[PDB]
Design a protein around this ligand. Sequence first.
Ligand SMILES: Nc1ncnc2c1ncn2[C@@H]1O[C@H](COP(=O)(O)OP(=O)(O)NP(=O)(O)O)[C@@H](O)[C@H]1O
Ligand SMILES: CC(=O)N[C@@H]1[C@@H](O)[C@H](O)[C@@H](CO)O[C@@H]1O
Length: 355
Amino acid sequence: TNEALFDVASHFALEGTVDSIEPYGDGHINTTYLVTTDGPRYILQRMNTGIFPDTVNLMRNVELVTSTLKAQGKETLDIVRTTSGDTWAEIDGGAWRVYKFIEHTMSYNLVPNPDVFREAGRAFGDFQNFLSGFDANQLTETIAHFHDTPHRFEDFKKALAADELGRAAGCGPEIEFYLSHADQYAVVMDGLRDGSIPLRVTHNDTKLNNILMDATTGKARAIIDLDTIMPGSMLFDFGDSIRFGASTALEDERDLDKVHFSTELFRAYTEGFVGELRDSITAREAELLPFSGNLLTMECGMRFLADYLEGDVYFATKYPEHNLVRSRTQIKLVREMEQRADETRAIVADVMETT
Ligand SMILES: Nc1ncnc2c1ncn2[C@@H]1O[C@H](COP(=O)(O)OP(=O)(O)NP(=O)(O)O)[C@@H](O)[C@H]1O
Ligand SMILES: CC(=O)N[C@@H]1[C@@H](O)[C@H](O)[C@@H](CO)O[C@@H]1O
């Protein structure tokens, strides 16, 4: 594997002699490596072509978004071209790209304090304003039905019916949760379809670890993981951030007694996010901010459970029950979100008042 990785790196216009190439992060989707040279560092990624089969359109999107950010003077992912001059390469059956390593940054897999999450809100709120500069038609959907929760639920039911590994028998309570909540999945798609929720270009994977913060100041430096930028609703970006970051625990926390929905963290993110968007957010969008957290958490939880039932073909895992463990944290969070619905509505109202 090491020899193969060094060979891959040799296809790119790196500006130093490679000393090591090692797995970096715990991403579920692409395979990411840190390339350390005698000078600069790089991120080398093998794109998951099972999930992103249309590499040409994916890289066209990434090139467009990054070049636009650069034209505005913003720090972003800097593609390092192949020695042949291309934005990526097919090498020995894999699709590979390289970015410059963004130095002097911190990222977080869990909110350590409310200020970090407030800053995350500012960063993703600001990113909505950036993406509003694009026509929906400029950025291709890299994955269809991506936050179409009813479509995700159809996929879940298919996984359940197939029950390829006989795993359904051991996750009855979790299956029942997603079945019983089925009435709740259509709200955003219904509003997009009838024009009552604006169709906007969105990031679509707004977990906290997709923001790099400055290692000294804590100020957002750059939003990363640009692979799912495509038309959607602002509510997908807000709700997914709340899913991941308003939790008191890791997404794959095995001890459910550590998992809670924090209204303090909800408030911190809301203050940052709405602060960037207050005069643009529609009445209907504002009405749905609290529930968007429930919706995206249920969608992701359902996807984890579907993957568990399918033998973990979608998300990377470290052990057999990993996706079940992930699905369970999402369920616990939704149950707590339901209990705090009046509070979160009040928080949104207060932020709307003070901004
Ligand atoms: N340009 C960069 N500079 C520094 N770190 C980076 C850069 N690009 C990616 N990373 C790191 O790579 C890891 C995540 O890569 P990412 O492309 O977000 O993974 P993904 O698999 O496509 N999505 P997911 O698997 O669900 O996390 C994180 O640990 C980031 O800190
Ligand atoms: C391309 C893709 O499926 N990305 C997913 C994202 O949708 C999901 O919310 C997250 C859960 O941690 O894992 C990945 O980042």
